[model samples]
Target chain A: INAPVTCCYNFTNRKISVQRLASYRRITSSKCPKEAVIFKTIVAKEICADPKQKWVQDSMDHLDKQ
Target chain B: INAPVTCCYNFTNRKISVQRLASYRRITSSKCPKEAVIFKTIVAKEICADPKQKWVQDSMDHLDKQ
Candidate 1:
């Protein structure tokens, strides 16, 4: 059992390649006052992104297929 | 703008020394199906524990002070 430890207070405007993403999680607006997609990269880095962004949503959708 | 990944499906019954805890996150029941306290250790490892546990609750309360 485990819980994630990080929260995104702000978002990155730049888009990442879907190929670099390993996974994603949906953050609720109620928890940290913002909704976002936290993308985990193949390198094990966590990227905070705005879910409304087309690229972010696309990336999340792509990863979900896996 | 970032959300967390890694939900605890089960909880650890063992108590962790609060001194090893660096931070904690409150995982809502809606997201993970079970409520838990995700404690980040000094080494950056995550520990999932029952939120109802006295030690877990105490650890969360202690970290909230910071």
Candidate 2:
């Protein structure tokens, strides 16, 4: 399981460490390890989706706009 | 000249406005507008490279270390 890091580099200048994302419930790609948080972005596309890190789906699940 | 915003979402969770990167000398992509600051990240690839904003070239030029 060798997952990629979520640099988000869209808003943040630095790479979002696997450490900071502990609060969000994350799903893992079998290709990536548990420490590897899947980065789903407009740019990343299918490159990061072998097992496909369901961050978009996961984030939507976590999206509680009440 | 529609340049993309530099969002270093990797570390910082914010979109870096074009106003902030004034110091760095940047070239323009004929395809992108002048306001756009051309985001050159590892993932963007050739998709953002019609004219290919020379950020890598420019950054290297500015990589002055004394």
Candidate 3:
């Protein structure tokens, strides 16, 4: 799969939770065609790029680290 | 094609310029299946979402429209 979503499933509750730390897998097979393939096999680490990060920084207001 | 660009050609100068006022086309055929289809067959008005719009506003510092 090009884009793979790593989710942890609880067998008891049947609930799925996205794995933040352990997620991201690399591609292995090289025989697959390019057009058929969606995303590259190599998966990189997850990084947050949301605008909310700016808000968090402003809220700190240069206060000493707690 | 899902996304198409509209350009105007000047026969005299042999130059092509994109039309800013009029553009955007919608898909008509619906026989295509889900997988084969890329984007929905609905074409909407173009809108800009760039952050530079805020900078233009701040520079004016005007209470009334120009």
Candidate 4:
């Protein structure tokens, strides 16, 4: 099993958008869980922008390591 | 004037729950502006679970800091 992944953020919007930049496999081994999955979690850090028009953004990318 | 608020998090759920932990007033001054509102913002940092079952969480708290 792989260690859990963590994310941190700083925002300029009332709402923050956590965008998925990219994902790539690092190793190619049978020991790697064939069905290993990835998940994302969001936490509100602060309110800085206009309350009436705030939002958050996030994205996920899948990769198949050969 | 108040400093901007910021929060950070670590997750164990497929869907992170950014609950409204708590809020309290700090001062009671007439000069203190009225109608000061509080807001919330969320940002996703990392993924560590099933791809199909991840969600972001956020919460808002209002205070009449008196």
Candidate 5:
């Protein structure tokens, strides 16, 4: 049984959070990077839209099918 | 088919990161809170013993059985 939120491993960064960005609705870089989406779901949206954090941005697709 | 890290839904804090405090070895409050482990695996540690982010700390039990 999976929880509402999930955990994922990121290569460049071991951690991911949207706490400072604002809230759940507003997606930023880490919340919605262009590439390297280490993990994405209603559980976890990995990576950053930041220049340094990523070598290349990855598009995101969440497992939000509840 | 789970990734290396797993994402969990934290009740008090929607996000978690160990970037600021230190590294993987040094498990601080959020990285290793006391009682309310919302999401934990080898993936996330969750919450701060800092008195704010959590109302009740939760001891963690990661699914670290590989």
Candidate 6:
């Protein structure tokens, strides 16, 4: 019922295919110094991505269609 | 860049104060058997709560204010 604390301290420089992504949660600067998006993969993995990245923004837009 | 997989396979029956909560991510039935809300505490801890709970619904509404 409880999950170990999770936070995005850094962003991944690599691009990830949107197909592998499911949902996403925005990490605002209020939570951490780095404002990023934590993309939840289909397999339930969390990848911290740079919000400024074109791929990251596009992927978020894609997932938001639902 | 990556976080250990996190999901709410179960729900905690205990009620938590919304003041302790920071943000929340919904886990639809598509991802797990139990549809729940993963409430992120101000300290960044995740607490899995039954979305049907009155307190949970209230807390979510309170959080949605901003």
For all predictions, the C-alpha RMSD in Å is: 9.5, 15.1, 19.8, 19.1, 13.9, 10.3
lDDT of each: 0.76, 0.29, 0.21, 0.25, 0.29, 0.76
| Residue A33 CA displacement from its true place in model 6, Å | 1.4
TM-score of each: 0.51, 0.19, 0.12, 0.15, 0.19, 0.49
| Candidate 3: tens digits of C-alpha lDDT, residues A1-66 | 211111111111111122222222222333321111111112432222111244323323222232
Model 3, B1-66: lDDT tens digits are 211111111111111122222222222333211111011112323322111244323322221232
Model 6, first chain, TM-score of 0.82
- Across residues A16-53, which tens digit of lDDT does each residue of candidate 1 receive? 98878998877774546677778889998887898888
As a whole number from 0 to 100, the lDDT of residue A40 in candidate 6 is 86
Candidate 2 Cα misplacement greater than 4 A, ranges:
A1-56, A63-66, B1-56, B63-66
Can you give the lDDT of residue A64 in candidate 3? 21
Docking class of 6: incorrect
Q: In model 6, where do residues sit more than 4 Å from their true spots?
A: A1-6, B4-66
Best by DockQ: 1
Which one wins by DockQ: 1 or 4? Answer: 1
Of the true interface contacts, each candidate retains a share of: 0.51, 0.00, 0.00, 0.07, 0.27, 0.35
Candidate 4 has a DockQ of 0.05
Superposed by TM-score, candidate 5 places the C-alpha of residue B34 at a distance from the truth, in angstroms, of 0.9
For residues A1-66, what per-residue lDDT tens digits would candidate 6 score against the true structure? 255233476688788887888899886534356677898899988888888989999999999894
| Candidate 4 per-residue lDDT over residues B1-66, each given as its tens digit | 112321122223433344422332222223332212122223323222222222321222222221
Candidate 5 residue-wise lDDT, B1-66, digit = tens: 223232323344333333222212212234222322333324443332322343222121112221
Ten residues in sequence with the least summed lDDT for candidate 4 chain B: B1-10
Q: How good is the docking of model 3, as DockQ? A: 0.01
Candidate 1: Cα lDDT at A3: 43
Error of 1 at A12 (Å): 11
Docking class of 2: incorrect
Q: lDDT ranking from best to worst?
A: 1, 6, 5, 2, 4, 3
Answer with 3 or 4, whichever has the higher DockQ: 4
